[PDB]
Amino acid sequence: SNEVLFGIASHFALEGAVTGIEPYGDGHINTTYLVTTDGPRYILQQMNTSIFPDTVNLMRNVELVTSTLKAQGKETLDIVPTTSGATWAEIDGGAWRVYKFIEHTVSYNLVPNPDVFREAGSAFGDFQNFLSEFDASQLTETIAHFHDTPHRFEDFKAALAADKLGRAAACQPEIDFYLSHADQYAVVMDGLRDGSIPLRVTHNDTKLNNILMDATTGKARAIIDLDTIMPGSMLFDFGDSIRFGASTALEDEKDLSKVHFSTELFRAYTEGFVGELRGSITAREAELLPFSGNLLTMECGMRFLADYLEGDIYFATKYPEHNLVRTRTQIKLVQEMEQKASETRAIVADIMEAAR
Ligand SMILES: Nc1ncnc2c1ncn2[C@@H]1O[C@H](COP(=O)(O)OP(=O)(O)OP(=O)(O)O)[C@@H](O)[C@H]1O
Ligand SMILES: [Mg+2]
Ligand SMILES: [Mg+2]
Prior knowledge:
Layout: H1 2-9, E1 18-23, E2 31-37, E3 42-46, H2 55-71, E4 89-91, E5 94-100, E6 105-106, H3 114-130, H4 149-162, H5 172-180, H6 187-194, E7 200-202, E8 211-214, E9 220-223, E10 230-232, H7 234-245, H8 263-277, H9 283-287, H10 289-309, H11 322-339, H12 341-355
Antiparallel strand pairs: 1-2, 2-3, 3-5, 4-5, 6-8, 7-10, 8-9
The chain binds adenosine-5'-triphosphate (ATP) and magnesium ion (MG) (2 copies).
């Protein structure tokens, strides 16, 4: 309520007298408010400390990345300090932060067309490019092992072994798909480990609703939602974007005849992404762009299936078989990626040469 909210806002060095504070946006993790003043506007968020208990480390990650982008004249989340100079405030139990409102933007939920998907690729390619000289090792793992696929596979096997709901009996083909792909899961972790794949900043929630684009030009403006900034390989981010974004269907589509991996959307994202990162991407990274799609789609699928086997404790579900329906789309997508490897390899090689 306003009196509590107005009081909360008083903790921050706003550059305008507060005039209103109301719920804003469609975020589901933090609690987001729009602060209107006699002047500029702000985003005020109560941070979800159940999901992110370590506020100091999370905000440290956000400060490091945003400071680097700001230092280079790049638009990003701009933290407004507390009146005491901190990046966030402890208030009667809660953890609160303020960002300058990024004005004159729009954003998308579902991918509307290849052109917008290309611009999403451009947004994250630009993000990667301007962080190419940032020492990613300074960042902490806010969610440990987040895209450590071998670790996720161990978790999957534990859920399978426990079979607490006796659900394994009903999904043998899905289980065997993940078991049979076992020797593929370590490709990127091994690469990061031996230095053949660069350690880079990773965003880890590359969904389009985190890419603000200009309200008039439609061009990428800024990457937001920096809660999950961590070290990793950019292949984790690229692969996941391909996972959700190059599908012709929703993640929980029941009719598998409608679920396809679209090479047109793959080409669109890759054009935008590589177009901005051509001077930094390594040969090994380029080599793995198509496979990163397989990897992150398999990782996501195995997590859905593990959750199904464990009684749906991690992902929200709407009906008993929701996670099983989800895992099946991810399986369909990977098999198509496997079968179109010739095409995607050729697509990447062509885009690499064109970007020059
Ligand atoms: N600096 C900003 N300027 C303008 N709009 C913003 C800013 N930060 C967030 N938003 C908007 O606020 C809402 C919440 O965004 P954010 O991605 O930070 O939410 P979240 O709490 O991480 O939840 P989720 O992970 O579900 O998105 C979105 O509608 C987003 O468009
Ligand atoms: Mg978001
Ligand atoms: Mg978020």
